[PDB]
Amino acid sequence: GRVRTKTVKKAARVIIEKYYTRLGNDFHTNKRVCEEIAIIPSKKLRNKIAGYVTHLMKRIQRGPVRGISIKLQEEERERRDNYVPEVSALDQEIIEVDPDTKEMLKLLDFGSLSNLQVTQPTVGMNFKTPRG
Amino acid sequence: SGALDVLQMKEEDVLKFLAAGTHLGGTNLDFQMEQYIYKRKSDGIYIINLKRTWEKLLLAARAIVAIENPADVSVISSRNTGQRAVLKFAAATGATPIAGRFTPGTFTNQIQTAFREPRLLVVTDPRADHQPLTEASYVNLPTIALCNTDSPLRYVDIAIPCNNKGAHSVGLMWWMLAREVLRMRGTISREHPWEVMPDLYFYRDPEEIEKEEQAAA
Amino acid sequence: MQNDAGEFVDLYVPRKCSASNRIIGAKDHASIQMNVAEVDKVTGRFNGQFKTYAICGAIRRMGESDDSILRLAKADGIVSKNF
Amino acid sequence: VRMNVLADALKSINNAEKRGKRQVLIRPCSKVIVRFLTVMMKHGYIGEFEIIDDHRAGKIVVNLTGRLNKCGVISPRFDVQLKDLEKWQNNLLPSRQFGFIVLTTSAGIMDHEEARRKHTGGKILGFFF
Amino acid sequence: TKKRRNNGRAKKGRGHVQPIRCTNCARCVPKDKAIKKFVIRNIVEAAAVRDISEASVFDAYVLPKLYVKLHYCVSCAIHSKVVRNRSREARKDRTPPPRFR
Amino acid sequence: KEWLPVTKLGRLVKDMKIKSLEEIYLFSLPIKESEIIDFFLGASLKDEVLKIMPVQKQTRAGQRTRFKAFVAIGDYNGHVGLGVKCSKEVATAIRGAIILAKLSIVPVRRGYWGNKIGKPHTVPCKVTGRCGSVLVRLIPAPRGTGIVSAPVPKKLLMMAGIDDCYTSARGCTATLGNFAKATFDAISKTYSYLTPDLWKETVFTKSPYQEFTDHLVKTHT
Amino acid sequence: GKCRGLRTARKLRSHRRDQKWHDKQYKKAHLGTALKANPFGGASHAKGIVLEKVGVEAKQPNSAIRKCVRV
Amino acid sequence: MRAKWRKKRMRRLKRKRRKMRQRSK
RNA sequence: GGUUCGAAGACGAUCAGAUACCGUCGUAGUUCCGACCAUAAACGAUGCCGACUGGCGAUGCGGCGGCGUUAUUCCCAUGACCCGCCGGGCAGCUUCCGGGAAACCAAAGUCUUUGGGUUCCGGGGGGAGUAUGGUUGCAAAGCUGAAACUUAAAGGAAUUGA
RNA sequence: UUAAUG
Ligand SMILES: [Mg+2]
Ligand SMILES: [Mg+2]
Ligand SMILES: [Mg+2]
Ligand SMILES: [Mg+2]
Ligand SMILES: [Mg+2]
Ligand SMILES: [Mg+2]
Ligand SMILES: [Mg+2]
Ligand SMILES: [Mg+2]
Ligand SMILES: [Mg+2]
Ligand SMILES: [Mg+2]
Ligand SMILES: [Mg+2]
Ligand SMILES: [Zn+2]
């Protein structure tokens, strides 16, 4: 089995986390890049780390990777969190109102409103799942 | 909160409650949550009383504002519905958020790196965050909990009856509680509305994110 | 806790729950001190004085904590009497 | 069937004190129970109670504090003299500082301290502390 | 010790039920204690249906089914691997195995 | 040697802004650091090893024997603890038992018998404590009697400063771990019992976390 | 006790008087069968004539020859 | 040794003792 | 009266040996009526009555209320469904009520903070449910029921190896 | 199918 160990995988994740701009698709380029940036004592471990770097870069080019903190993907995530639309979906011209909700709003202070719409009650009381 | 015309329920909050569906409760019933329900509908859905929801929100706002340090109020969400909401709530208020993967032992184990000793917990869902309730059972930690009619009140301390399943309802109740605490401490005057729009706190389906990305360009 | 002379001779006076009227032990690590803030009636902001409430761990593990908080707040005038 | 109404009512209020209720409904109203509640009232273990009087065995609603540790009962009604009352309060009360053993006397239903004051023994009712 | 709450059966308020002879052995098992498999079975399983549909006289005639309610005991069920032993937390989960295949 | 604090309460103890552990036992804060007790009560604190218990588990290559140290700790005025720690060697076992005992000291409540003049000497009321089948009851005693008890809970009450106490026993008291934990539960429930002297309403003073919340964020994270 | 009536003295006394006979020390002390089987007959010491000397083999693990006398 | 067959052997032995005693009677 | 099955018994297999497990027969029995026997792992290994302390979804019977579908058909009123309320009937699930040695138990809880009322029954393991005495039965056996002597353990729950 | 013992 050609299974990479944790000393390969965690070190490769640290290398890609610190030097995402330097690394690339080509194995013989980013192998020498990892040789320059990282102090690896042996060529076999260096080749394992470089191969797992190439595989994680293929995973990054395919999509997002869970156990990594890329600055560009973090900026994209922050942008998608800070995205604000134009008009709110809570502001509606017609709001569907059930009759018991209309009764409790009538017993509250806000009985009559401007933009509500009392609908007909759903006749036929069949809401539970059949057993077994 | 009691017989005070300033802290009453507001007509701009009524329509947003009705649009988000926070009164739209669950199908089943927990016995502790029976005092917050007005009447059960047809098709088996309890109605959460919005005025009493506003009162529990006001008391939780008291519990937040009474803590002097804003940084040590733990704001926890494990489900994906409230992960954006707790992070933006902590960014708005000044708290320390927990959004997904709550490690067991962050309140008890010293040698762990994320050993925080807060003063107040604000729980998104009881069944989803049963474990922070267990660490708040061993550490002297009061608890705020956004609870449904089905949600139990085990080890919670001040609960707000809400619809914790609807993604609009959760973010809307986070927005109401955030506006209320930022109006209670000296940031926002209550005459003018707050600038930040309630769609910021809502969690987005990635299918809807791809739909908006197609519709924008 | 006085003696025949009248001196406070105990070494600490323990806390007492405001809901069940029972004292809290030294290692009841689930106990609370809920601090409810005060609101100025003309301003609507934080004053500085508090309303504290202690609850032992038995009421929390039973499940009657927030109901007791609501009753004590309604008694002290925090929550409206209508509710 | 129901043998000791007083013992049933005091076990009911003991379970209510152990669970932590603010008030409890005990179902029969007996004169012995009402005098027991007034004896606990004059020492302040419980709140102010009331009885609901139909033209039957009435009911009693007792407002409960958290001061009552255990409300007990001694069945049957053993005779207690002034010589033996020291041994009774030795082996039934947790301390000689607090705790009370009420027992019915010729002067009336009253606790052991007032029994020492008025010099009259009698049949034991129970204990409460 | 008491291994099960309902003691390997479903008798709670009866005290006595009628016995049934087993299918593999001739063991006399109580009715609620026996493992009951209601086997539905198409009379040909996999490969013979392709030949029957060609050699049949009537066009598009459905093949019959063979309904057998097998009653096994505990020893026969575990020997023929109908039921297996479970862990002490998994014993209480009395949900049936699924019907995807 | 220099204790770097981890907990917020330990930081307050190292800053000396809480005056005693009486407020810690008031607010029921967990003492998880061991050097807090050596700071406050380290002058009169005493260690006595009760029993080394050689328990063992069976492996495929014989059995693995590891010793279970029991340590009774406490100064002679109120605060005593019972530490239980099992480890591979007896020195680390006794050291860990002392550390867990410092984490789990409790104060004892002492009262009067009859006349209330002088210092309190005995258990104020008939209290009890149990774990497993071992049941240990503590009875009030007159002055100058001595702890009328078995030698190990007599040692624990002599550490507690309860000079006079009648006792009772029930169950297999030969198991010294459950026996010491039962008398430990009794002397812990001495404060958990509701005394009628405590009928005064509790005026809640301010928690030290809420007191010094500015120093706790300006001197560290 | 189980029956806690005000006048159950003969019931409690007769039940305890019946149940004392199931104790091992009480029945051995209060029946004459053990006193008859005792060679001393309720005596602490007894004189007797030696007739032979016996070498008694020992029990399990301890293995020896004890020295006894047929008195 | 099963206690049931021990009880059965004791019943056989009691039947033998009754048969031996009835012959002497 | 005996269809089937089937103690005993016979035969054929297996095994070193089977007077056992396997197969083929096969008596008593298994079936009905009239009399005995009164023994079960006769179990919930949990006496009976009464009071109290958490919920959840059910099921069974009876009674009550309420949107609406489906039968009598031509409507009122009754059956089948749906949502609830109450009494107990067997149960189940859930958790730091509480208990217990634990497994576990809403009772096995309300027990050293020990007392609701009442029967039967145990006092280390064997000997031994044996001898003897009495009584019942046609018999098998049923009820009551020791001692001498011997032993430092026998046993229950749970953990880790094998 | 057989598979007993220390
Ligand atoms: Mg077994
Ligand atoms: Mg049966
Ligand atoms: Mg045959
Ligand atoms: Mg043969
Ligand atoms: Mg045969
Ligand atoms: Mg029998
Ligand atoms: Mg039985
Ligand atoms: Mg008892
Ligand atoms: Mg015996
Ligand atoms: Mg020996
Ligand atoms: Mg047995
Ligand atoms: Zn079978």
**Distance from C-alpha of B184 to C-alpha of B7, rounded to nearest angstrom:** 10
- Distance from the alpha carbon of residue E12 to the mean position of ligand 2, in angstroms: 12
Residue D103, strand partner residues: D110, D124
* Number of domain units in chain D: 2
Q: Are F3 and F15 in contact (CB under 8 A)?
A: no
Q: Is C54 on the interface with F (CB under 8 A)?
A: yes
DSSP reduced 3-state for G34: helix
**Distance from C-alpha of D73 to C-alpha of D6, rounded to nearest angstrom:** 8
Q: Are D97 and D129 in contact (CB under 8 A)?
A: no
Helix (H) or strand (E) holding B65, with range, is helix B50-65
Q: Which of D68, D89, D116 is the last residue of a domain?
A: D68
Q: Is the dihedral of CA D103, D108, D114, D117 positive or negative?
A: negative
Helix (H) or strand (E) holding B37, with range, is strand B37-40
Helix (H) or strand (E) holding E19, with range, is strand E19-21
Residues D84 and D104 in one domain: yes
Residues D15 and D74 in one domain: no
**∠ CA A37-A43-A49, rounded to 5°:** 55
Give which of A94, A78, A64 is closest to B200, Cα–Cα: A78
Give which of E1, E29, E3 is closest to E17, Cα–Cα: E29
Q: How far apart are the CA of B40 and the nearest CA of chain A, in angstroms?
A: 8
**Distance from C-alpha of F73 to C-alpha of F82, rounded to nearest angstrom:** 6
Nucleotide with C1' nearest the G23 CA = I123
**Distance from C-alpha of F35 to C-alpha of D64, rounded to nearest angstrom:** 44
Give which of F101, F99, F97 is closest to F79, Cα–Cα: F101
How far does CA A16 lie from the centroid of its chain?
19
Q: In the PDB record, what is the listed experimental method?
A: cryo-EM
| Identity of residue F67 | F
Give φ, ψ of E4 to 5 degrees: -130, 150
Chains G and C touch (3+ CB pairs under 8 A): no
First to last CA, chain D: 28
Q: Which residues of B98-126 are buried (b: 16+ CB within 10 A; e: fewer)?
A: bbeebeeebbeeeeeeeeebbbbbbbbbb
DSSP reduced 3-state for B89: helix
Give which of B10, B34, B14, B11 is closest to B22, Cα–Cα: B14
**Distance from C-alpha of G52 to C-alpha of A23, rounded to nearest angstrom:** 106
Which of C11, C28, C55 has the most F C-beta neighbours within 10 Å, making it the best mutation to test the interface with F? C11
Cβ of F7 and B110 within 8 Å?
Answer: yes
Q: Which of D68, D83, D106 is the last residue of a domain?
A: D68
SS3 track for chain F: CCCCCCCHHHHHHHCCCCCCCHHHHHCCCCCCCCHHHHHHCCCCCCEEEEEEEEEEEECCCCEEEEEEEEEEEECCCCEEEEEEEEECCHHHHHHHHHHHHHHCEEECCCECCCCCCCCCCECCCCEEEEECCEEEEEECCCCCCCEECCHHHHHHHHHHCCCEEEEEEECCCCCHHHHHHHHHHHHHHHHHCCCHHHHCCCCCCCCHHHHCCCHHHHCCC
**Residues around the ion ligand 2 (C-beta < 5 A):** E 15
**Distance from C-alpha of A118 to C-alpha of A116, rounded to nearest angstrom:** 7
Cis peptide before D76 (omega within 30 of 0): yes
Residue F165, strand partner residues: F147
Cβ of A110 and B9 within 8 Å?
Answer: yes
For D14, F36, F80, the CA distances from F104, given in Å and listed in that order, are 32, 12, 8
Q: Which nucleotides of I are covered by protein (CB under 7 A)?
A: 43-46, 49-59, 66-69, 82-84, 89-98, 100-105, 108-124, 128-132, 140-141, 146-149, 151-152, 156-162
**Distance from C-alpha of A109 to C-alpha of D10, rounded to nearest angstrom:** 47
Q: Are A105 and B22 in contact (CB under 8 A)?
A: no
Residues D89 and D30 in one domain: no
**Distance from C-alpha of G37 to C-alpha of B59, rounded to nearest angstrom:** 86
Domain with F52 in it: what CATH number?
Answer: 3.30.160.20
Q: Are F5 and F14 in contact (CB under 8 A)?
A: yes
What architecture is domain C1-82? 2-Layer Sandwich (3.30)
**Distance from C-alpha of A107 to C-alpha of B50, rounded to nearest angstrom:** 12
- Cβ atoms within 10 Å, residue D73: 18
If you write DSSP's letter for every residue of B125-186 in order, what string do you get? -TTTTHHHHHHHHHTT--EEEEE-SSS--TT-SEEEE--SS-HHHHHHHHHHHHHHHHHHTT
Q: How many CB pairs under 8 A join B and C?
A: 112
Which of C36, C47, C61 has the most B C-beta neighbours within 10 Å, making it the best mutation to test the interface with B? C36
Tell how strand F105-107 and strand F79-87 pair up: antiparallel
Q: Which residues of H2-21 are buried (b: 16+ CB within 10 A; e: fewer)?
A: eeeeeeeeeeeeeeeeeeee
Residue D60, strand partner residues: D26, D51
**Distance from C-alpha of A40 to C-alpha of E16, rounded to nearest angstrom:** 77
The dihedral region occupied by F132, where left means phi > 0, alpha psi between -120 and 50, and beta the remainder, is left
| Chain F positions in Cβ-Cβ contact with residue D98 (cut-off 8 Å) | 125, 195-197
- Judged by its nearest atom, the ligand closest to the C-alpha of residue E77 is 12
**Distance from C-alpha of B96 to C-alpha of B105, rounded to nearest angstrom:** 17
For B80, B123, B164, the CA distances from B171, given in Å and listed in that order, are 12, 13, 9
Give φ, ψ of E23 to 5 degrees: -95, -45
Q: Are F86 and F51 in contact (CB under 8 A)?
A: no
Q: Are F72 and F180 in contact (CB under 8 A)?
A: yes
Give which of B4, B17, B46, B5 is closest to B177, Cα–Cα: B17
Q: Are F216 and F11 in contact (CB under 8 A)?
A: yes
- Distance from the alpha carbon of residue D77 to the mean position of ligand 8, in angstroms: 18
Contacts of E82 (CB under 8 A, 6+ apart): E35, E37, E72, E76
Q: Is C79 on the interface with D (CB under 8 A)?
A: no
Residues D39 and D97 in one domain: no
DSSP reduced 3-state for D60: strand
Q: Is the dihedral of CA G55, G57, G58, G59 positive or negative?
A: negative
- Cβ atoms within 10 Å, residue E15: 6
Residues D50 and D98 in one domain: no
Residues D48 and D94 in one domain: no
For D39, D110, E89, the CA distances from D43, given in Å and listed in that order, are 7, 11, 52
**Distance from C-alpha of B76 to C-alpha of B107, rounded to nearest angstrom:** 13
Domain with D117 in it: what CATH number?
Answer: 3.30.1490.10
**Distance from C-alpha of F206 to C-alpha of C65, rounded to nearest angstrom:** 21
| Chain B positions in Cβ-Cβ contact with residue F217 (cut-off 8 Å) | 69, 71
Domain with D5 in it: what CATH number?
Answer: 3.30.1370.30
Considering only alpha carbons, which residue of chain C is nearest residue D20? C20
List residues of B whose CB lies inside 8 A of any C CB.
1-4, 6-7, 32, 35, 51-52, 55-56, 58-59, 61-63, 65-67, 136-140, 142, 152-159, 183-186, 190
Considering only alpha carbons, which residue of chain F is nearest residue C5? F117
* Residues of C 3-22 whose CB lies less than 7 Å from any atom of strand I: none
Q: In this structure, what token pair is assigned to residue B11?
A: 């007509």
Q: What is the resolution of this structure in A?
A: 3.0
Per the listing, tokens 């019907």 go with E99
If you write DSSP's letter for every residue of A64-128 in order, what string do you get? --TT---HHHHHHHHHHHH---SS-SS--SSEEE-HHHHHHHHHSS--S-SSEEEPPP--S---S
Residue C50 DSSP symbol = E
Residues D96 and D125 in one domain: yes
Q: Are D100 and D45 in contact (CB under 8 A)?
A: no
| Identity of residue A117 | Q
Give which of F153, F147, F140, F162 is closest to F184, Cα–Cα: F153
Nearest CB to B66 within list C50, C61, C80: C50
Residues D44 and D93 in one domain: no
Residues D80 and D129 in one domain: yes
Residue C16, strand partner residues: C23
Q: Are F80 and F156 in contact (CB under 8 A)?
A: yes
Breaks (C-N over 2.5 A) in chain F follow: none
**Distance from C-alpha of F83 to C-alpha of F68, rounded to nearest angstrom:** 10
Q: In this structure, what token pair is assigned to residue B29?
A: 């019933």
Q: Which domain holds residue D37?
A: 1-68
Q: Which residues of C47-77 are buried (b: 16+ CB within 10 A; e: fewer)?
A: eeebbbbbbbbbbbeebbbbebbbebbbeee
Q: Is the CB of G4 under 7 A from strand I?
A: yes
Q: Are B57 and B173 in contact (CB under 8 A)?
A: yes
**Distance from C-alpha of B179 to C-alpha of E97, rounded to nearest angstrom:** 51
Using CB atoms within 10 Å of the CB of residue G12, give its burial: 0 to 12 exposed, 13 to 18 middle, 19+ buried. middle
Give which of B191, B24, A108, F192 is closest to C44, Cα–Cα: B191
First to last CA, chain B: 47
DSSP reduced 3-state for G6: coil
Helix (H) or strand (E) holding D114, with range, is helix D112-118
Q: In this structure, what token pair is assigned to residue F13?
A: 């103890």
Q: How far apart are the CA of B217 and the nearest CA of chain C, in angstroms?
A: 45
Q: Which domain holds residue F34?
A: 8-106
If you write DSSP's letter for every residue of D61-90 in order, what string do you get? EEE--S----EEE-SS--EE-TTTHHHHHH
Residue B34 DSSP symbol = G
**Distance from C-alpha of F91 to C-alpha of F97, rounded to nearest angstrom:** 10
Q: Is the CB of F193 under 7 A from strand I?
A: yes
**Distance from C-alpha of F201 to C-alpha of F204, rounded to nearest angstrom:** 9
Separation of CA E21 and C1' I23 in angstroms? 20
Give which of D16, D45, D29, D5 is closest to D125, Cα–Cα: D5
- Cβ atoms within 10 Å, residue B142: 26
Cβ of F7 and B139 within 8 Å?
Answer: no
Nucleotide with C1' nearest the C62 CA = I97
Q: Is D67 on the interface with F (CB under 8 A)?
A: yes
Residues D95 and D116 in one domain: yes
Tell how strand D79-80 and strand D59-63 pair up: unpaired
Q: In this structure, what token pair is assigned to residue F85?
A: 């720690």
Q: In this structure, what token pair is assigned to residue G40?
A: 């001393």
Q: Are C25 and F185 in contact (CB under 8 A)?
A: no
